[PDB]
Amino acid sequence: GRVQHFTGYIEDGRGIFYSLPDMKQGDIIYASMQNTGGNLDPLVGIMAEEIDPAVSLGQVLEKALASENDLISELTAVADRIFLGWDDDGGKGYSASLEFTIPRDGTYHIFAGSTITNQRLDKFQPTYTTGSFQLILGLNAPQVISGEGEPEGEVFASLA
């Protein structure tokens, strides 16, 4: 197992990308992203080539949404398209975790950002959240998704 820690801050819907160069088929990536301050509801994803979720998620934010069921439907359609694998905290966990088996050799990217949730009692008008997080990445290190984040072995990821 190789485990590696990152700290970041989410403002203005600017998610952060992390590069995973030279991943090999069959490697398993584990990621956990926890809120460490502010109202941040984490969204963690993995993709092959770096694409920007801000564009498609921005379009979800404009939609006329009447309920959490409508939001889950739109968000899922977008996220399933954008990411090879993803997880959010359902607007309740403040922690998001993912397990992903690398399908082919290559460079992958982890995205750490905010999901979309409703925070108002006066209407259902969801928005992004803001705050700090700790992102734990594991390469064949399953202890990451059991809450055992201790860093170990050589680095395999960096800020993209």
CATH code, domain with 130? 2.60.120.380
Binding residues for Ca(2+): 41-42, 88-89, 94
Binding residues: 41-42, 88-89, 94
d(CA 135, CA 137): 7
Separation of alpha carbons 1 and 85, rounded Å: 21
How many domains are there within the chain?
A: 1
Distance CA 109, CA 18 (A): 5
CA distance 130 to 114: 7
Residue 19's Cα: distance from chain center in Å?
13
Distances in whole angstroms, Cα of residue 22 to Cα of each of 33, 72, 105: 22, 34, 7
36 burial (CB, 10 Å; 0-12 / 13-18 / 19+) is middle
Residue 33 and residue 96 in contact, taking contact as beta carbons nearer than 8 Å: yes
Instruction: Give the C-alpha separation, 141 to 39, whole Å.
Output: 29
Residue 105 sits in which domain range?
2-159
Resolution (A): 1.8
